[PDB]
Amino acid sequence: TTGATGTVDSVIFTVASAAGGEPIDLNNDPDDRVVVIDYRDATQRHTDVDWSVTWLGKNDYDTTGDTLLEQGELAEITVTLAPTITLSTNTDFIIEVKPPAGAVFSIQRTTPAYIETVNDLQ
């Protein structure tokens, strides 16, 4: 919903492998996922929210079945917040990602003062 009293629907970002690559499984099935994603702000907290993945460019997922992330592949992740979690203008939130192995990283941003259909957080 747009306006000064808007409401965020989803959060999108892309990931890729690092130097000295080693594959990481990106299966998103609720009973087989090994990557956990959390949401937090100063009012509420939810753990193990649901997400979906889309592959861009050269991938081996569309041909056979592969869900490992290896050299040359690029993945897009979407976290849905629409009906259950409420988020609006002028607020700080945190998205936390915990891979089975490697490094744990966070994402801290701040919702703008007027929400439009598509917004950028440089």
Partner 1 sequence: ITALETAIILIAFVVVASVFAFTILSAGTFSTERGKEAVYAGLSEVRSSIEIKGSVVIIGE
Residues that bind partner 1 (CB under 8 A): 18-21, 102-106, 108, 122
Closest distance of CB 55 from its own copies, Å: 10
Geometric angle at alpha carbon 21, from 101 and 59, rounded to 5°: 100
Distance of closest approach, residue 6 Cβ to partner 1, in angstroms:
21
Which of 64, 84, 117, 122 is in the footprint of its own copies by CB under 8 A?
A: 117
Q: Residue 83 touches which of partner 1, its own copies, none (CB < 5 to 8 A by kind)?
A: none
Q: Is residue 7 at the binding interface for its own copies, with CB under 8 A as the rule?
A: no
Contact assessment for residue 5 and residue 89, using Cβ atoms and an 8 Å cutoff = yes
| Region 9-68 residues binding its own copies, contact defined as CB under 8 A | 14, 31-36, 40-45, 47-48, 54, 56-58
When binding is defined by CB under 8 A, the residue of 53, 68, 74, 85 that contacts its own copies is 74
Q: What are the C-alpha distances in Å from 19 to residues 23, 41, 49, 72, 79?
A: 11, 32, 29, 12, 26
In a 3-state reduction of DSSP, which class is residue 36?
strand
User: Which residues, in sequence order, are CB contacts of 85 under 8 Å at separation 6+?
Assistant: 39, 44, 46, 49
Contact 102, 62 (CB under 8 A): no
Tokens 């957080």 appear where? 121
Q: Which residues bind its own copies (CB under 8 A)?
A: 14, 31-36, 40-45, 47-48, 54, 56-58, 72, 74, 76, 98, 116-118, 120
